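Teaching assistant's notes for section 4

Start the section by putting this record on the projector. Ask students to predict, before seeing the second block, whether DNA-binding protein SATB1 will look compact or extended. Collect guesses on the board.
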Amino acid sequence: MGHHHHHHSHMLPPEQWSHTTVRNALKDLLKDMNQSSLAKECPLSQSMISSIVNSTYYANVSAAKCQEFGRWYKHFKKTKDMM
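Reveal the predicted structure now:
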């Protein structure tokens, strides 16, 4: 807050799905789509997703489920550029 900073990076094209990038995306899907209903169409593990959103002492998260999420992102939205 305070000084209104803007990111020059782009969350629309899969540039790199780091813990921050993925976490900031999930929190918008989850707030309107229930945990189970989300993990249903998503190829990720339900309790893992739940642990990431509420990661207090968790922290230690795998990178694979993030890169594959960026791959799923393409098949989910179909934002042009396909294989």
